[PDB]
Amino acid sequence: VARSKGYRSKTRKLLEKKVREKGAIPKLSLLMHDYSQGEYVVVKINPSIHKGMPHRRYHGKVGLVVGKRGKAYEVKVNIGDKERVLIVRPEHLIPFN
Amino acid sequence: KENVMRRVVLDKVTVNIGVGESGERLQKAYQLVQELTGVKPVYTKGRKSIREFGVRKGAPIGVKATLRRQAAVEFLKKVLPAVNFRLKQSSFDNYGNVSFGIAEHVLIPGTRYDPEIGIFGMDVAITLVRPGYRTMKRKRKKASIPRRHRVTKEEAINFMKENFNVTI
Amino acid sequence: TQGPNYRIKFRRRREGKTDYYTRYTYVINNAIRFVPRLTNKYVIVSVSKFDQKGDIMIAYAHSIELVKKYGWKGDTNNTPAAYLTGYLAGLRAVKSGVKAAVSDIGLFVPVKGGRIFAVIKGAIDAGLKVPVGDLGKLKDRVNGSHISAYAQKLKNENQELYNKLFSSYIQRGLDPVLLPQHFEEVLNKIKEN
RNA sequence: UGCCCACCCGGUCAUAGUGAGCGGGUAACACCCGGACUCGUUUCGAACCCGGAAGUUAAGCCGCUCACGUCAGAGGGGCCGUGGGAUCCGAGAGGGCCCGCAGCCUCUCUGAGCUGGGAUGG
RNA sequence: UGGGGCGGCACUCCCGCGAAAAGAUAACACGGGAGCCCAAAGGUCGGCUCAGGCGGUACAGAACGCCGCCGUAGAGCGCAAG
RNA sequence: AGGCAGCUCGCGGGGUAGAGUGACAGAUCGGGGGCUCCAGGCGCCUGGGGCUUCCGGUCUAACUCCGAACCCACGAG
């Protein structure tokens, strides 16, 4: 049988949360930084924040910030040879390096 | 003298009437406890439904009234003479509580009559407290108190022998 | 605690001091906060700013420096004292550079006519634009008119309100009845600098 | 002065936690005293809110000891994997060698609160 | 379509596993679901804490109401699974 | 006028082999102590059942308090 291609399929363990990270958002110090254009970020999905959540295929990728729309950011990521632009809420981002 | 802060005080003498249903008995039970205490009572909702015993969620099945300082002691002085020998050492827990039931309300040494309303039973709960218990029930910076500061069973008996001259 | 399946709450949540659900909203929206705290004897006001390593104070004000700098004589944590501390806080904040701020009640209950709303109103008169609903305090409480009426009922219980304080036995002439008159002379003193 | 000790707002979110027992305050933090007024309890000035100040270190809070928890370092013990190679072994299951990397559990011992911004005390 | 037929639907969609710790990946493989329901089971604001157990209370009983102690979730969140 | 099929360093992502079971869910073999009922024998003894507690043992494609080799994104060389 071929697999169902829902939005959150084959994510039983990617969207786990370890016992010491559970609860409504713990880390506020990452949210106190305002990314400017040209910065590098890492797309890290937060399983407990259900707004502005990216797709499984982008978890752990490194993007470049190119703009801002509201409270969410426009991030340019490479998948293969293709450029893709995402709009991600800052709860799903960490700075790179 | 820090011993003044370890004193035992009376607090929250609560009267409960459990009729076990809703309608045609609550009001007369509501009227009954209205004059025993002198304060307006409250209906008590039931917990999770059982579908037997007739209880269901949100259904008022009981009436309670809470008395505080300088009126709790007066009310206790008029219900105790009925059951002076009913109070037992086994009915005291290890945290400063004691409870006793009244089988028949007119048994009280008061001006009770037998109108067409009928007769009910009563339950009385007595809570013994020390100064500083506010730390468990305040809103901000609430904490917990150790067993060191709690009222013990042995000293709770003394508070009943004194100020009330109760037996056993 | 029982082992490897137990998760510990935040330290300020365990102490019962901070509400992190409201604090989450401020950080997302990058608010500059005006924080009117209270205690059993004083009132504390601070104007904060978010930072990675901890909040930066922009301005500060305490009720102890009402008596040590402007000759306040009444209680240090009643409604007229809440207004005066807030007025002083707004003057320091505006002089420091900020012109608007967001109220941060904390874990206090927002009751109309209370001390917390008195602090906010005092800061508004000083010139700090704090958004507020049309349901603030009452103007007869700020000057202490309600305190004087209670003192003026000394005729029955033979006791004036202001019993002598901890050290006011031989130093402070408490006069609760003439409290509103004492209010504006202090207010005019901080209004000029 | 001083530096660090509480308090207000925090960051890290158990090496920081939980329980028990003890130590410490003439200020600060609290319990505490009372309700005319703003406000309030489907009853209760208990809680919330307002006004106060006699009393106390007994609670909370801070520090210390001991039990368990947690994170590491060291030591004894149980289990054990893997990327590349060969006309290597073996009927196969599997195994050995060459070059390249490790891991998990359990006992025993030893430690265990750091830190940014502002008004009281030493 | 392990010839076709009979059967089934692996013929549209969703969850786990197959799947080899990025991505992609087949079987007439395995374990199951959807084709709706709700004017509230939707929006916001406030207060509160759940299942289970222990001590004391008339009828009261494992399980009615009241007074206390513990409880990291062992509950609940329309319906499958996560 | 730059490009990336390869490698190194830096900085991140992951839940597989293994390993555990008192860390959740299921399965699974024995012993000691305490409580209770039933049956048999002369208050005691023996057997069966249920609960609790402590000690050891066996497992998991649709278990995880853990966790390699390895693979991958980005920057520089």
Author numbering:
A (entry chain L21E): 2 to 98
B (entry chain AL5P): 8 to 175
C (entry chain L18P): 2 to 194
Please give me the paper's original passages concerning this structure:
The ribosome is a large macromolecular machine that synthesizes proteins in all living cells. We present 10 cryo-electron microscopy (cryo-EM) structures of the archaeal ribosome from crenarchaeota Sulfolobus acidocaldarius (Sac) at 2.7–5.7 Å resolution. tRNA and messenger RNA (mRNA) translocation through the ribosome, catalyzed by the elongation factor aEF2 in archaea (known as EF-G and eEF2 in bacteria and eukarya, respectively), is an important and complex step during translation. Moreover, the structures of archaeal 70S ribosome complexes support the idea that the mechanisms of the translation elongation process are conserved in different domains of life.
During our termination complex formation, we first incubated aRF1 with aEF1A·GTP and added them to a ribosome–tRNA–mRNA (with UAA stop codon in the A site) complex. However, after solving the 50S LSU structure from this termination complex sample, we found the density for aRF1 and E-site tRNA. In the 50S–aRF1 complex structure, only domains II and III were traced from the EM map; however, domain I—responsible for recognizing stop codon—was flexible, and no density was attributed to it. However, in the Sac aRF1–50S complex, the long helix containing the GGQ motif in domain II swings 18 Å more toward the P-site tRNA CCA end, causing a steric clash with the canonical P-site tRNA. Furthermore, inspecting domain III of aRF1 showed that it binds to the L11 stalk, and the L11 stalk RNA backbone is 7.5 Å away from that in the 80S ribosome. However, in the 2.7 Å aRF1–50S structure map, H68, H69 and H71 from the starting model fit very well with the density map, indicating a conventional structural conformation in this complex. In the aRF1–50S structure, we did not find stretched H68 and H69 from the inter-subunit interface, suggesting that aRF1 binds with the 70S ribosome first and sticks to the 50S subunit after 70S ribosome dissociation.
